[PDB]
Each structure stands twice: as structure tokens, then as C-alpha cells.
Symmetry: C3
Subunit: 114 residues, 3 copies
């Protein structure tokens, strides 16, 4: 799986260890080994949400399976909680798009997972 | 909805008010409230279009519904017009990918829209 | 088509000519004219893969058609090979998501490809 967070919060406010925390919490949440979890945080972005440039986060989670109605509600509660505690972004300013990828459409290690 | 523009034009060439114009014009085009709209502009990117490093943009619009053949033609005319007028990017050096999101695949405020 | 690479490799380690090499190789691989190939490289990113900050890449290829089981295996060998040769990223630290776009969902030049 791959989790990407784009945010207007400054780089210095991303705590040391945040990528590791995302890696471990997503490995547990998705039930996949951490070897397969990639995370990417992009601070200092020029963005607005609802017309306001107060702190916000625009995110995506792509996974081969482990995506669905109940699972995504669980991920949204987990990820909003982490972004609130660690980046001080209010949960009503976190927006997450979820993607269930087919294995044939994910490349890795010179081939694909199909 | 979420609208992202990635471009090689420099940050200083992004005029004041640009995120607000995107929010307001996308609210009218999609019919969605400005409250639900996120906009994100990423200048100074290392990009080429058609083998050329002249000004270009790669963009995406994600929305729960309000995506379709006629609507996407209308969005493309609106958004290329804004990128030409405000960033001086030729419309034939702009790509916009459109994504009709299922409500269950959009998280916000500790939940999803399922 | 559009190919995007996000990587933690520093900008100085992206060799001269890399975007042009990607354009030409993807034009041949997808069978589309180079005029239609857009490429975007994002170095210096804050990313982890498998819990490690060793060099890695998260990429996507979007194309109207020319996406499939066999084709995506071929693209993955080609692109992992380029990332290993040119950016020194191990293929087991690369993900590439593939997107077969409907023509109506790709905007260009004030309209769409539909
Ligand atoms: C930001 C925000 C959003 C929103 C966030 C991200 C993306 C989209 C919207 O939805 C909301 C919503 C709500 O339900 O938006 C969507 C539900 N909607 C039902 C019918 C079909 C289309 C989807 C309600 C109150 C405040 C809000 C709100 O303050
Ligand atoms: C992410 C990552 C992965 C990996 C990614 C997804 C799934 C599985 C692994 O494998 C690796 C590997 C590796 O799997 O190598 C195999 C050889 N290995 C040699 C020594 C004895 C055991 C076998 C090596 C280095 C970095 C890595 C590495 O950074
Ligand atoms: Cl995955
Ligand atoms: Cl970190
Ligand atoms: Cl589920
Ligand atoms: Cl939406
Ligand atoms: Cl339509
Ligand atoms: Cl969806
Ligand atoms: Cl295409
Ligand atoms: Cl195929
Ligand atoms: Cl599509
Ligand atoms: Na506004």
C-alpha cells in the first residue's frame, strides 16, 4: 500500500518519527507486512480547503484490496487521529481518497503483482 | 472535490488570488459547495510535455459524481482557460485527469461518505 | 500518457536528460507519439518504503489504453530498469500504479479525448 499526505503545515512541524509511525500503523491497519507499506509526506504546500488556508491535509491511500466501506471508515478514524495529534490538523480539514488497486495494475521489482 | 495542478511555472508567476479563483470557479462548474472543495497548486516542478520543457501543467479533479463526458469537456475548457490566463500555460500543454469517486472511497472528519 | 515519479533521491542525483529519456522510452513503450507523453519527476521527497528512508520511488503511469497484464509487466521492467540505472533506486523499492483512463476522463486543450 501507499499513503500520501500533502499539507500546508511547515516541514519543521512534521515530528521526527512520523513516517515510521505511519508505516507501523498502516501495516497494522491494513494487515500487510511493513515491507509493502510506502509513505510520503509533502509539507509546505500551497493549498486551500473550503476556501481557507488554515492547516489541512489532502491524502490518498492505495492498496491491493483491504479497501471497502467499513475498512475505509476505520482508516479515516485512524488517519484523522494521527494527523490531528501529530500535525495538529483538525479532522474536519483532512480529506482522504481511497483506491482499491488490481494486482495487475501495481508494478514492483521489475514486474507486477498479478 | 479536490483539484490539483502541478506545473513547471515558477511560484512567483502564480498570481495572488489563484486558489480562490479555482475554488469559486470549480464550485460553479461542479455545483458543489465551496466548503467541499480543496485546491492545491504545485509550482516549480521538473516536468516535460511532448518532450519539451516549455510551460505545462498536469492536473487532476476528483469528485463524488459530477464527472462525465459533457461535464468533463466543460471543466477542461474552464480550467485550461484559467491556466492560460493566470499562468500563461498553453491549453495544448495541459492534461487533466478526472476521477468519479465512490462516496465510500472518500474519507473526511473521522468517517467516509458511504 | 503521463508518467510521474516521486522519490527521495536528491535533485542533484537526477541526471541531465532524464525527462527526455523517459519521454522517448515511454513513447516507444506505449506506442503513442512523443507529443502526447508528459513526464514529471519529483526529487527530495520525504518518503519511506518498507520502513526505510533508503532510496525509493512511488510512480504512476496513466494512459488511454495500452494498459494490461502483459503490458504492465513490460512497463515495470522498463521503468524499474531506468530508475535503477539512472537514479540508483533498487527495483524492490519502487511502486508503479497503472491507470487505463477512459478518453472522456482525460482533459487536454480545452476539451477531452472522447
Ligand atoms: C468539507 C465537507 C465535506 C466534504 C469533504 C471532502 C469531500 C467532499 C465533501 O462534506 C460535508 C458533508 C457531506 O455530506 O458531503 C458529501 C456527502 N454528500 C452526500 C450526497 C452526495 C454527495 C456526497 C456534510 C456536511 C459538511 C461537509 C463538509 O464540511
Ligand atoms: C522494501 C524492501 C524489500 C521488499 C519489498 C517488498 C516485499 C518484500 C521485500 O526487500 C528488500 C530486500 C530483499 O527482499 O532482498 C531479498 C534477498 N535477501 C537477501 C538476504 C537474505 C534474504 C533474502 C533486500 C534489501 C532491501 C529490501 C527492501 O528495502
Ligand atoms: Cl498494495
Ligand atoms: Cl519522519
Ligand atoms: Cl470493508
Ligand atoms: Cl468529492
Ligand atoms: Cl456529463
Ligand atoms: Cl472510487
Ligand atoms: Cl493517453
Ligand atoms: Cl496486456
Ligand atoms: Cl477512467
Ligand atoms: Na475562496
Amino acid at each position: 500500500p501507499m499513503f500520501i499526505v500533502n499539507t500546508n503545515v511547515p516541514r519543521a512541524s512534521v515530528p521526527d518519527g512520523f513516517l515510521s509511525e505511519l508505516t507501523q500503523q498502516l501495516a497494522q491497519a491494513t494487515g500487510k507486512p511493513p515491507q509493502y507499506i510506502a509513505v510520503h509526506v509533502v509539507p509546505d504546500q500551497l493549498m486551500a480547503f473550503g476556501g481557507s488556508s488554515e492547516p489541512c491535509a489532502l491524502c490518498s491511500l492505495h492498496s491491493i484490496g483491504k479497501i471497502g466501506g467499513a475498512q475505509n471508515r476505520s482508516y479515516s478514524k485512524l488517519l484523522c487521529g494521527l494527523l490531528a495529534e501529530r500535525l495538529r490538523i483538525s479532522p474536519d480539514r483532512v480529506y482522504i481518497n481511497y483506491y482499491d488497486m488490481n494486482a495487475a495494475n501495481v508494478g514492483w521489482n521489475n514486474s507486477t503483482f498479478a
